[PDB]
């Protein structure tokens, strides 16, 4: 029962070796392995379309039967490396093949990863949520039998079972040096939260990483991994075995349609100056007033541009706004607008996400008693937006943890013997009612809620809205409210209300969402004129600081710079403008001065 020859494997290995034999051709893969040898790694990367071009049949054979074809491929790779250099091949017991390129049907998402893809290559794109600790997995254990003076081996691979006795019950001692071990980490991927329906459920897919692939991933990373989707031994559980991992850019881009780009460019070139004000009016038209707040919310969505210095600095471009006001004010309604409006947002309560909370947390599995580093709500909002309601009700641990992300944009955790430093750069829109309602304009904003004044320093902007009993103002709001009440769709007969379905001038939210996404790609830079202008404005504000919100400081200066940068995005200007700084200056003056 000993297999002698596999002609299919023989030919398939030769076909790869011919493909790897890149000397008659441009040398791209021959150079890659040469660079790989210089790199001293043992995992070549491969574009599938090259294989398709050189042999469509072989590439189809590979994708339809990932396992055996890769084994032939790794055979060819090791042989090819040994051809170029035997001793370097002898350094490593094996080599590995990383796939890359286009996959028509096999490029899917965890939502769309069907069971049909079992045993096929698949390029799953998604977001990391959970990561396990790095552990050394034993694959091949060498044992020695002094009684027989005999060496025995065993391979586990996909296959209590750890042998310790000879068949004659001689003791066996494990040659730890000769035995083969490899670091091995497990992570979980989910669909990108922006592009996922609320009706459906999560589709979490488990990924296995080995060797160099182990720590090329962290929780809250947007990645695509190519691997072999497989079942597990026993109704069965299914996991993906990674063949190559890459962290795609989290910014991505607004592809959409060129029609959207043309409409955006047409609208932008229509009135570039009024686009900021027009968007603000159409940002939250269901709520009358708070127009400066709407301007700031727009600034938050567009945000600034991060500056990183020679000293490893990461001077943030994000903007953080806090809103305080008595209950029964549209604060909650504002957040619903932002969630519907923002390109990449995520809501959360004062409690935070269940268990994990705002930032990440370490959770044992409790199914096998296994530690897992779970990303929190804040981490998933990286390079996005987070909306926090009942921000006053934040827990004390979270009240401390918010400091790091607000300052550095990165959360760290060394607890439970588990070491991680995750990215959480996220412009945050927080809101909190005053305690006992009934805000008083005599105490600090902190004293009405309690924030320690570190958070208030951290927040770029703070806006206070009060339930003033002005009959004129209340008439304006109430008349607006009743106008929304009286409003009926053009197609309707004033009769029945909308059906109870199971599913869930003024510009559209979607088009606005498209435009801000396009604007977010824009990278407005500074102008010497505006830089001079704002510097005078800041020093003027320092002069205004003589009068006795927080005093103006260098925090406020950088807040203005991001605000002008955000307005620079709003008009799509490739540089900031005096209009941008001027709009920011009046906005800040409105915030600190009523």
């Amino acid at each position: 029962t000993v297999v002698l020859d596999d002609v299919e494997l023989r030919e398939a290995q030769r076909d790869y070796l011919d493909f790897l034999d890149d000397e008659e051709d441009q040398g791209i893969y021959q150079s890659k392995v040469r660079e790989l040898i210089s790199d001293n790694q043992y995992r070549l990367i491969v574009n599938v379309n090259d294989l398709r071009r050189k042999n469509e049949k072989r590439a189809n054979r590979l994708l339809n039967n990932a396992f055996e074809e890769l084994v032939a491929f790794q055979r060819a790779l090791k042989d090819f490396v040994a051809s170029i250099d035997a001793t370097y091949a002898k350094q490593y017991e094996e080599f590995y093949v990383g796939l890359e390129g286009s996959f028509g049907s096999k490029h899917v998402s965890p939502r769309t990863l069907t069971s049909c893809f079992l045993s096929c290559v698949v390029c799953v794109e998604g977001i990391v949520t959970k990561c396990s600790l790095v552990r050394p997995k034993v694959v091949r254990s060498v044992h020695y039998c002094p009684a027989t003076k005999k060496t025995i081996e065993r391979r586990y691979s996909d296959l209590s079972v750890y042998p310790t006795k000879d068949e004659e019950n001689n003791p066996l001692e494990t040659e730890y040096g000769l035995s083969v071990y490899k670091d091995h980490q497990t992570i979980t991927i989910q669909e990108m939260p922006e592009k996922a329906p609320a009706g459906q459920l999560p589709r979490s897919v488990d990924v296995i990483l080995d060797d160099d692939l182990v720590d090329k991933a962290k929780p809250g990373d947007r990645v695509q991994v190519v691997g072999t989707y497989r079942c597990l031994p026993g109704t069965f559980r299914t996991v993906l075995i990674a063949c190559n991992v890459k962290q795609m850019s989290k910014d991505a881009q607004p592809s959409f349609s060129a029609e959207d780009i043309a409409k955006i460019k047409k609208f932008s070139k229509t009135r570039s100056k009024d686009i900021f004000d027009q968007l603000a009016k159409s940002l939250a038209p269901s709520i009358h007033g708070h127009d400066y707040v709407k301007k700031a919310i727009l600034c938050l969505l567009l945000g600034g541009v991060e500056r990183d210095l020679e000293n490893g600095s990461h001077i943030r471009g994000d903007i953080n706004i806090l809103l305080i006001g008595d209950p029964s004010v549209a604060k909650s309604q504002l957040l619903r607008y932002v969630l519907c409006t923002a390109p990449r947002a995520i809501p959360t309560t004062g409690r935070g996400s269940s268990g994990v909370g705002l930032t990440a947390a370490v959770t044992t599995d409790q199914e096998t008693g296994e530690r897992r580093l779970e990303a929190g709500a804040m981490v998933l909002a990286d390079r996005g937006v987070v909306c926090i309601d009942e921000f006053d009700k934040m827990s004390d641990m979270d009240r401390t943890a918010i400091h790091e992300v607000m300052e550095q944009g990165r959360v760290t955790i060394a607890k439970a013997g588990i070491h991680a430093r995750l990215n959480a750069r996220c412009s945050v829109l927080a809101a909190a009612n005053p305690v006992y309602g009934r805000y008083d304009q005599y105490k600090t904003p902190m004293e009405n809620i309690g924030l320690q004044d570190s958070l208030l320093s951290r927040f770029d902007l703070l806006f206070i809205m009060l339930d003033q009993m002005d009959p004129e103002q209340d008439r304006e709001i109430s008349d607006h409210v009743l106008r929304m009440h009286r409003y009926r769709a053009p197609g309707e007969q004033d009769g029945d209300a909308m059906p109870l379905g199971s599913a869930v001038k003024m510009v559209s939210a979607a088009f606005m969402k498209k435009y801000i996404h396009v604007a977010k790609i824009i990278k407005p830079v500074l102008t010497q004129e505006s830089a001079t202008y704002i510097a005078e404005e800041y020093s003027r504000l320092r002069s205004q600081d003589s009068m006795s919100t927080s005093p103006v400081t260098a925090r406020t200066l950088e807040t203005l710079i991001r605000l002008a940068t955000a307005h620079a995005k709003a008009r799509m200007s490739k540089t900031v403008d005096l209009q941008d700084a001027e709009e920011a200056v009046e906005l800040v003056q409105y915030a600190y001065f009523k």
């Binding site: 939260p193 979490s204 409690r351």
Partner: protein
């Protein structure tokens, strides 16, 4: 929804009813994805304290 002793809700239920009255929806967050269940239901609460 007739609720006798609405004061005696569960703490998680107390969290959930907030969004429920505020949005007629129950949101359950599993990591990033947060599924939503529609509850456009009137409520007749009763209590003593």
């Amino acid at each position: 929804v007739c609720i006798d002793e609405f004061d005696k809700m569960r703490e998680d239920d107390r969290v959930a009813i907030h969004e429920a009255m505020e949005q007629q929806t129950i949101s359950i967050a599993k990591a990033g994805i947060t599924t939503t269940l529609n509850s456009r239901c009137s409520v007749l609460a009763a209590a003593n304290s």
